[PDB]
Design a protein around this ligand. Sequence first.
Ligand SMILES: Cn1cc(C(=O)NCc2ccc(Cl)cc2)c(=O)c2cc(CN3CCOCC3)ccc21
Length: 1044
Amino acid sequence: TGPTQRHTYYSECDEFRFIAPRVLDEDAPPEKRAGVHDGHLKRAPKVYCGGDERDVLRVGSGGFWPRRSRLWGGVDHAPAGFNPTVTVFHVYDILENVEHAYGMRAAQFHARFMDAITPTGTVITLLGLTPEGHRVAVHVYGTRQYFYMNKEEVDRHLQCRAPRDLCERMAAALRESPGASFRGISADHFEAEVVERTDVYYYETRPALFYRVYVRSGRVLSYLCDNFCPAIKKYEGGVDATTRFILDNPGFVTFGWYRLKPGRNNTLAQPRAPMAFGTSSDVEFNCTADNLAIEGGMSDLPAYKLMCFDIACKAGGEDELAFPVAGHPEDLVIQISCLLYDLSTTALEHVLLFSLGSCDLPESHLNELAARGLPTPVVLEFDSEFEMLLAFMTLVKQYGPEFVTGYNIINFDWPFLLAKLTDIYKVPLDGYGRMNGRGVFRVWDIGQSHFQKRSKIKVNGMVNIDMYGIITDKIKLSSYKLNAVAEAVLKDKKKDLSYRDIPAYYAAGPAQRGVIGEYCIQDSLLVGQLFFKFLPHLELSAVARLAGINITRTIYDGQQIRVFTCLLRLADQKGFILPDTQVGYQGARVHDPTSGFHVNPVVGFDFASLYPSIIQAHNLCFSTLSLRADAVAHLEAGKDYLEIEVGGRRLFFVKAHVRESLLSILLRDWLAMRKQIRSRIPQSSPEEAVLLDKQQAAIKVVCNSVYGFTGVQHGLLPCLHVAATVTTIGREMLLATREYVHARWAAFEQLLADFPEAADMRAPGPYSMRIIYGDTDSIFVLCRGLTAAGLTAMGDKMASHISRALFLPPIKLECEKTFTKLLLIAKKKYIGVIYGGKMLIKGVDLVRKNNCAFINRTSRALVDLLFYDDTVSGAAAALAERPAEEWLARPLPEGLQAFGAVLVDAHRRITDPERDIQDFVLTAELSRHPRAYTNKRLAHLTVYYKLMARRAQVPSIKDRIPYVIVAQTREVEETVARLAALRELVSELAEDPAYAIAHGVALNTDYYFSHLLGAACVTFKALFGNNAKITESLLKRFIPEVWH
DNA sequence: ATGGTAGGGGAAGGATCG
DNA sequence: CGATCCTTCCCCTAC
Ligand SMILES: Cn1cc(C(=O)NCc2ccc(Cl)cc2)c(=O)c2cc(CN3CCOCC3)ccc21
């Protein structure tokens, strides 16, 4: 009969816009080859492979790429008698769509589904595979969104006193909509129960009557919540139908192994006829939710496919050496490397090269690959950009990669390709996902927006995992160029590339373009290696399984949604309903440290998950809070509730036995689950142990996300009172721990009394025990008069004692570290030597990946000497012997001599050429869209605008920009004045390392030495009563005066 | 659309004091 | 009236 849901992906083509560089035409004179052919053409798209040629949209007998498709434009490319009986199947992503009965009356669906979607019905499509390998999509009918409204509030506001009345008013309001989107919608299209529920906010709140309204269309529910009755609180109206399908059917997950089973009236699932399919899948199914169950024994992934891909493009305009622009039809996409792996076997299965202008890959590359057990690359030759891109999209649709990865493919690759396919070549994308049409293929940028905080890529049925963000979150670097990341993680350096070199390599011919192919394939291989080292798919799938959210929203839609979903589950379970809404509170207090170098033993105590344990112990929650005394005036204070003053206002938190905290329950259950699964790591195969580790990681993530979720003003379900109470309780606890240690163990008598272990630990000097440092949940205590022999093993017992004697469970204080020497520099900045010989650096420019590697190495060597050299340590002790104030006129002790040496060596490396300029590059992140800036006079901003004027690589909206500092010259000052006049010395001397190396520009030698001295001053002011000016002065005594 | 409060220190520019 | 400070913004940390 034909398809029931029109396939919008191109299966036929007879005429297209042809664009291709004239440089590829050899029979043309070497003079008439500069430009780029552009114009309409009327021939069928074709692709060349190995001397043979075939139409791009030709599918069947002989193909160049692998194909996992069945339907292709109303053709059933499946061997007749293909009726695989499906029992179990794995699910990775979930679609939420609308289906009308009038549309589907052609399809021979059962009566049940047509009743489910009679005017319009929401359908939940589970996508995945069978164990055999078949692509499968099961459609779940019956899922209905629903939201609550107070009955006492609605009855009197809308002059109605019955649920059918509410249905009538809703239908009417939807009729007189702006655009008459819903015309003919009537009251019988809605269901309205009356049910007793409780608002989650505040203990005083008592149950009441709410109208529960069931809605079949996300559009209708959205319009209702937006402008139905704005003066009435609406509950859970944002909950999408997928979340309802997950939570209302207990046991279900968003990622895992399901099984078809018999249903309510002995109902069985029904398989769809091929012409009714709506996916690029081999078999599809219709079923209600009771036809589904979970399968337990199943634990391993199925044969999901992962396409890793990178692209490379070239300009076409007057300047072919400038960076391309996808909006200009002259700049084209020259090459696309695309390699497909199997995710269950982490093995590479196919490698493909899409190229404009046929080529032969270099032989060193081919030899390395074929020797590394990898498959033989297959090159696809194209004459135009349209044919190449169409073939790439046809590959995406036919092979149907369930997962897709690359590097910086969110800000460059996908936007470039899709801008080409959309703005220039005019191609619809709604069918090139998993759905045959009407799908999702959008790409979000930041731009001049306020609400958005992250770039996203969402493709239905296609999980995009950009390894860029993965590395940015998991690894700490100064720059994230793919080759730098490769060398830093895998210790495998590979060739760099720039657009400045691409046109030449293209013009020389098929071999110098096969070089470009080699570079793209090497990039893609490196990305694949990173992917399967960090295993982001398993991590994020475990998070999705835990939070009841699909993999896509797991990745790109924030953290608040996960905590919100779990809390929604628990609150609906326990009788609440979440109301829809839409520097806040005092944080922690860092213990004012008395700075300096400490050589006596230091002990480090800290709390295990301080904020979650506070929430657990004190029963903090939305439902246990109250702002009014009369609410808690009927129970005994202290024994039944906790009175506390937070932010100049009294708060009451009813204790556990009155009303149990929802947050406490979530945290306790998550913690017990984490402990259970971690107890299985030993007696488990490493294959299983990787999954177990990802699981426990996800659990810890959500646990640490609880408090943050509570503290997001104007977020979803916010309650800053809880966050401020948590921080205040933590501050109080730290203060109390300090005072207890001070008062109870001032005398060594008591230290011996409680622990008969300080006998074999009494040091020469006098006994003292005083808190020296503290931050949020940490305590560093000085132990003059004790030996650092078993200070760890006795501080363990100490912390256990303090926890037992001071705090309610599950609050726990542990002894983690004991330092031999420690440098208290300033607030939240310190460096120390652990008793185990390992160094510890926090806060200082050392860890701050914004500085140049040279000053980093130098200051490192300095501190290394300060800790791993006995003479300079005794020298610091000598500096301590005296107040340091007199030393502006006194001499520095001999030990410090070493410093001078290293310092002067610095100067050498600064001015002496043949040094690496990359060893001298600064980095800085570009936070916002530059138009929204308050100073507008920043180094990386100068470099940004300069790169923009030079038609260079415009940095993506949130990367790190590298730069260097020029010295003042005639050209520098002249161009400064010229640019100033055009727009109409301070740190304007900032330049791209690239431009400033090929133009032979010289660095500001004075600046880098002055900042080496500044970093030294900042790091070593501690040893001189923390005075900066005095430290700079007496540091001048390590530098020849001809440099001051 | 959907990520918290503390911090220190560097760059840039205005205000202030003798 | 000229350095000295004093504000503000911005980077990236530690919890
Ligand atoms: C790494 N990190 C990120 C955070 C964050 O992103 N908050 C915003 C937010 C908002 C909504 C959601 Cl859903 C999720 C997250 C933190 O808040 C944070 C806090 C601590 C304090 N620690 C923790 C426990 O005991 C006391 C000391 C330590 C590390 C932290």
